[PDB]
Design a protein around this ligand. Structure first.
Ligand SMILES: [Zn+2]
Lengths: 96, 216, 169, 169, 49, 49, 48, 48, 345
DNA sequence: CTTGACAAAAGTGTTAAATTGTGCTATACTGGGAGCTGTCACGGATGC
DNA sequence: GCATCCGTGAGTCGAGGGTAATAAGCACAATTTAACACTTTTGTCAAG
RNA sequence: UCGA
């Protein structure tokens, strides 16, 4: 919206086109640093404010919400790595 | 120009409206009409089958001629699966892209066949199992073309009998739901279904697809 | 023992052996009739789905129901001063109501009828807090036709958390 | 610290789900209509899910990061950021076990295709309507003794367990 | 039309209220309601398409 | 700097909307011919031309 | 009028239904202080 | 849904048509349908 | 369909005649008092062997098998009891069986007048519980009225039972109702107020002003009281409320998140932190370190004059004047440099 | 940077006033209740 | 296997728009919260 | 509901 002071959304077809160009980072930054990423947007503002280059994002954070939703459905959400091993997507968060 | 509906009809491998009848072999052409049903016998040297046809839809072949595998009989569109198991995958691809481009070029839009080809190959990439043999597979348990290729090769090397299979063509929707990553189909549609059949089977995704990643 | 409802389905699904039914369905599949052959195909399909995955089907009867974090089910006020909230909240709430009321009925030795009925309401309520609309008219905020959006409600759909937040944003 | 190249999925078991949870949500109520503080067990409870305020406890004896993670003895809130409110789940312990409508009412119907059941069949079974046969124990039905993997009704269940009567007016 | 059906809701507000009670003190003064009708018609003029 | 328990709630104007002022109308709670929301004190409405 | 079935005693009372919005001059009602309008609707006429 | 009694077959069915309030049919519907079928009628119901 | 389900589930049993009623209450009370006399037998408590009656009647181990992970020990507190009175003479045994048949009687009774409850609660729809939910709570009301009723009272059980039904129902809605939990007395006064408001809305021929309705209430009731509890009245609005003329326009995603820091705020805080961090070194090596305590910098917790004094071995007064001169020296550097002049809110 | 004096800020102990939770009411109340429409295409289970 | 049903979909961003209204009661026990009294801490001041 |  306008009076809500908010940015444009990147449609599914927008995403697709962006991929069609083959801009990998532009897309990545778009879905992460540039939008909702946890420390991504923050560390970005930090970066440009200081003149440095924005680091690489970790979790889009809409994704994490998706994960915990699936958890509410008792869907076991297992994020592996280079070879078949549990990765902690939530840093120190729910370890009980 | 049947237009976009024709397009979707081709892309989803849906049964044609007017759908024409085709032969299942190369036989001899014979017309039989008892003024009731107009039927046409196609009979090879050692075989035969007839086909029930109405007196309305106008035929193509003339009596006493020769036929070919999957050769057209009545004027109108051809069912994809019909010629799939009849004339083979080659002519399937052929006619598919040919029709899509027929409508396209008709409407005044020109584009390279390449694209359409990519989609088409992505349609026929699945095959149904016949006689798993030494493999751990099961009859009628349907999977991808690539994988069964690899399987068969390995089994050849091991001195074990390979698997028979029938090329199985499906609509693009179905292919989207049958794709490797559960994430992709989950994003597409029929979410509940896919998620179920995925989580239960405990399938891990390698994020090989783009939108199977874009989520991540 | 005729026991009816979910506890029973838990019993049977807890007692199953996939090995026996595997080999059995194998020999049942080779049957020359395409019928038995095909049913074997599909049934053994899901069977293998449970085998290789190393997952136990009894979990489908799951007892302890995972609760979504509070900030994921937000409740906050505005300039107007009134408070708002999601639907999943109310769903969860009424659910726990049924579960607890049931618990207070069970130990006190309530009549079997009221008990069974309450268990019915338990299943329907849970399943409502998941797929709501999959069975009967969905439970809505009382007096309003607006259906209470559950988990599966947000996970799928056009504006669902998938297409709306992960494939575009 | 590690590249994530793979995303798996599976069936979460009850014990696993318990481990996910930081506690059971008892009182099905949002908060106090006065204090707006999460209710003792209320779904928004900060005592298990996570603190209402960043790096603080509930009652306020721990207000600062000088205490990190140490559980408060006057409250019982881990002192940490409110972020955990989104990542930390609860659970509800259901008295009587309950299945999940997903693999039930879905087109393939996992649980049904498993137990060799049917749609409307398992529909009235699971929902506490019709009985089923679990170890008949030499049970007779209309001359044909009933066996397991079968369904019964109310009248015949009581008739077989409590006997067949007739009331004469 | 909306007056018809809304006032039918009010008719529920009439037939039901007049028997819980004592016919002794009775009059539409205490038997007549507002919100079913007034809010039905309030609903037609806003939330409707 | 005194920490003044009173903080600024003031109502600004959105970007792109600017000009003179004509309409100024303010009615507090209890004013003649006015009703407010349950738990509000005053309200202010200004036109920007 | 409230008439008892038994005593046959007619007790007549006038009541107050509520506040129903009335039409303005140009034909546009005022709801919640905002000028609004009711757009005409159309459907196949009742009958056989 | 409900037990198939006799006395309730004179009620549940009655409200469907004979009830002027539950079948209420526009003065136009009665009108057009009347002059349509080539007949006549007054009540806005199906059957009295 | 779970509604019409219970609808046919209740009519599966006849209600009762006066005879059957009185008989039911008869064997009920005789059974319970038999349990009393049994409590005098082996020295068992009043309620103990009662729930034990349920242990061997309501079924097999299924009763206490899963009442949460904790209810009451089955193999310990129940088992021996089940075998402790099995060794006992004719009198205690006859009292035993009396108990059994009595409790069963309680059950049958309950089911009939449960048909009754069904009607009663069927009249209460729209309280926030659609049908069964409501009804079920209502049902348990009758249960409490079952054990508190006496056949001696010569009253049709329907009366007592009914009142208790409206009891369970009203308490349940008072304890559930709106998504926000509300105390019972509070709900009472709520519906009380709305009652009055309704009444004189119809009488006056218009809606009342706050003060006249609050006056219509009584002593101590003013416009502010009604306005107050009215503010509390309205419940949380659903986030799923569609707005606009379309389906796709929602509510929930229109809410700003201020509970978390913002990039501008992150860099702002980091800024004040750093700019003040370098502005630290221009202070006396002792008074800077001290200043980090009094203002609560080092460990985040402010250390009093006595503590910092106990740090440098100086009296608290020293620490005090240290703070004066430090903050003023910094004041010179500030009023000059004009670097940190921002952050004035 | 220091000692004593002293005002206020703050700490703590004990009560009065409020808020909130519980139980019960006895003539007799004993199987709901509300409706809604003018697709369309295909895939699957299911009843012919 | 042939007709006949639940089930799942269906275009992009936006601009605004929005705000609202049912239900029993009474005594009393159990706490909670507000009040009040007063000890101690701490910050300030006069003046070494 | 209206732009594109
Ligand atoms: Zn604390």
């Amino acid at each position: 919206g306008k009076a809500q002071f908010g940015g444009q959304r990147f449609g599914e077809m927008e995403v697709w086109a962006l991929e069609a160009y083959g801009a990998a980072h532009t897309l990545q930054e778009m879905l992460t640093i540039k939008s909702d990423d946890i420390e991504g947007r923050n560390a970005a503002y930090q970066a440009i404010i200081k003149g440095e280059d924005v680091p690489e994002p970790s979790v889009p954070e809409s994704f994490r919400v998706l994960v915990k939703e699936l958890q509410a459905l008792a869907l076991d959400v297992q994020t592996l790595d280079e070879k078949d091993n549990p990765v902690d997507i939530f840093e120190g968060l729910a370890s009980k | 120009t049947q237009g976009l509906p024709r397009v979707i009809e081709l892309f989803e491998a849906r049964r044609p409206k007017a759908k024409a009848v085709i032969s299942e072999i190369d036989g001899v052409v014979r017309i039989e009409e008892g003024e009731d049903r107009l039927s046409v016998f196609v009979e090879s040297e050692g075989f035969s089958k007839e086909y029930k046809l109405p007196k309305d839809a106008r035929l193509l072949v003339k009596d006493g001629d020769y036929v070919e595998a999957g050769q057209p009989l009545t004027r109108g569109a051809i069912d994809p699966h019909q010629l799939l198991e009849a004339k083979g995958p080659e002519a399937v691809e052929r006619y598919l892209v040919d029709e899509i481009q027929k409508v396209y070029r008709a409407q005044g839009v020109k584009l390279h066949d390449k694209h359409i080809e990519i989609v088409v190959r992505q349609m026929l990439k699945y095959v149904e199992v016949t006689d798993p043999g030494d493999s751990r597979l099961l009859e009628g348990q349907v999977l991808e073309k690539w994988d069964v290729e690899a399987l068969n090769e390995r089994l050849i090397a091991e001195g074990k009998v390979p698997v028979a299979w029938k090329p199985l063509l499906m609509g693009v929707t179905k292919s989207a739901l049958s794709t490797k990553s559960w994430l992709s189909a989950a994003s597409f549609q029929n979410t509940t279904h896919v998620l179920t059949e995925a989580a239960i089977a405990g399938k891990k995704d390698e994020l090989i697809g783009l939108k199977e990643n874009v989520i991540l | 023992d005729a026991r009816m409802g979910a506890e029973a389905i838990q019993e049977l699904l807890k007692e199953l052996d996939l090995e026996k039914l595997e080999r059995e369905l194998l020999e049942e599949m080779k049957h020359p009739s395409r019928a038995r052959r095909a049913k074997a195909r599909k049934r053994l399909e899901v069977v293998r789905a449970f085998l290789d995955s190393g997952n136990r089907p009894e979990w489908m009867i799951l007892e302890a129901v995972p609760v979504l974090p509070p900030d994921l089910r937000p409740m906050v006020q505005v300039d107007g001063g009134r408070f708002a909230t999601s639907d999943l909240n109310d769903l969860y709430r009424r659910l726990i109501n049924r579960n607890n009321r049931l618990k207070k009925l069970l130990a006190q030795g309530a009549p079997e009828i009221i008990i069974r009925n309450e268990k019915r309401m338990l299943q329907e309520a849970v399943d409502a807090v998941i797929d709501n609309g999959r069975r009967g008219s969905p439970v809505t905020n009382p007096g309003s036709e607006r259906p209470l959006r559950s988990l599966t409600d947000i996970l799928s759909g056009k504006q669902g958390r998938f297409r709306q937040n992960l494939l575009g944003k | 610290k590690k590249e994530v190249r793979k995303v798996r999925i599976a069936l979460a078991s009850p014990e696993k789900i318990r481990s996910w949870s930081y506690g059971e949500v008892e009182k099905p109520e949002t908060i106090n209509y006065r204090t707006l503080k999460p209710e003792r067990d209320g779904l928004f409870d900060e005592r298990i899910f996570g603190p209402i305020k960043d790096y603080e406890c509930a009652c306020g004896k721990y207000k600062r990061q000088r205490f990190e993670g140490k559980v408060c003895e006057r409250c019982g809130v881990e002192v940490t950021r409110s972020i955990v409110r989104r990542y930390r789940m609860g659970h509800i312990e259901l008295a009587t076990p309950a299945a999940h409508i997903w693999f039930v009412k879905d087109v393939p119907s996992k649980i049904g295709t498993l137990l060799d059941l049917s749609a409307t069949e398992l529909e009235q079974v699971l929902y506490f309507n019709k009985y089923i046969v679990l170890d008949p124990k030499g049970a007779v039905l209309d001359g044909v003794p009933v066996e397991k993997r079968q369904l019964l009704t109310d009248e015949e269940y009581r008739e077989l367990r409590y006997g067949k009567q007739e009331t004469y007016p | 039309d909306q007056f018809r059906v809304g006032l039918a809701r009010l008719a529920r507000g009439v037939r039901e209220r007049m028997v819980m009670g004592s016919p002794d003190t009775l009059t539409p003064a205490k038997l007549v309601n507002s919100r079913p009708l007034e809010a039905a018609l309030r609903e037609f003029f806003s939330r409707s398409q | 700097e005194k920490a003044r328990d009173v903080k600024d709630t003031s109502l600004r104007v959105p970007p792109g909307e600017g000009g003179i002022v004509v309409g100024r109308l303010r009615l507090r709670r209890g004013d003649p011919g006015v009703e407010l929301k349950p738990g509000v004190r005053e309200v202010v409405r200004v036109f920007v031309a | 009028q409230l008439i008892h079935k038994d005593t046959g005693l007619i007790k007549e009372d006038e009541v107050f239904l509520g506040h129903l919005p009335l039409m303005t001059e140009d034909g546009s009602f005022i709801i919640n202080g905002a000028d609004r309008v009711i757009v005409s609707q159309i459907h196949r006429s009742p009958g056989v | 849904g409900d037990p198939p009694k006799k006395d309730k077959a004179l009620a549940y069915l009655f409200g469907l048509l004979a009830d002027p309030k539950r079948y209420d049919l526009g003065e136009a519907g009665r009108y057009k349908a009347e002059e349509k079928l080539g007949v006549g009628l007054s009540g806005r119901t199906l059957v009295r | 369909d779970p509604v019409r389900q219970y609808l046919h589930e209740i009519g599966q049993v006849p209600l009762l005649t006066l005879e059957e009623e009185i008989d039911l209450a008869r064997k009920v009370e005789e059974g319970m008092e038999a349990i009393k006399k049994l409590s005098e037998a082996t020295g068992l408590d009043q309620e103990l062997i009662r729930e034990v009656v349920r242990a061997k009647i309501l079924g097999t181990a299924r009763i206490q098998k899963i009442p949460g992970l904790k209810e009451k020990p089955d193999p310990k507190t129940v088992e021996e009891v089940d075998g402790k009175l099995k060794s006992l003479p004719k009198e205690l045994k006859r009292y035993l069986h009396i108990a059994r048949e009595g409790e069963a009687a309680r059950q049958h009774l309950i089911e009939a007048n449960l048909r009754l409850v069904v009607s009663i609660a069927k009249k209460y729809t729209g309280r926030g519980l659609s049908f069964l939910d409501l009804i079920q709570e209502g049902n348990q009301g009758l249960i409490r009225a079952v054990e508190k009723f006496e056949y001696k009272r010569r009253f049709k059980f329907s009366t007592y039972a009914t009142w208790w039904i409206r009891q369970a129902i009203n308490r349940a809605i008072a304890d559930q109702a709106r998504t926000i939990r509300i105390p019972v007395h509070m709900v009472e006064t709520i519906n009380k107020l709305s009652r009055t408001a309704r009444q004189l809305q119809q009488e006056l021929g218009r809606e009342p002003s706050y003060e006249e309705i609050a006056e219509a209430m009584g002593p101590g009731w003013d416009a502010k009281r009604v306005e107050e509890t009215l503010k509390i009245a309205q419940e949380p609005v659903s986030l799923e409320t569609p707005i606009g003329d379309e389906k796709d326009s929602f509510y929930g995603d229109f809410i700003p998140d201020e509970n978390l820091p913002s990039p501008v705020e992150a860099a702002a805080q980091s800024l004040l932190s750093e700019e003040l961090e370098k502005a630290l070194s221009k202070l006396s090596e002792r008074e800077a370190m001290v200043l980090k305590l009094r203002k609560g910098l080092i460990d985040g917790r402010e250390h009093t004059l006595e503590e910092v004094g106990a740090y440098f071995g100086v009296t608290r007064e020293r620490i005090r004047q240290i703070e004066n001169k430090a903050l003023r020296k910094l004041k010179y550097h500030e009023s000059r440099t004009r670097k940190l002049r921002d952050f004035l809110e």
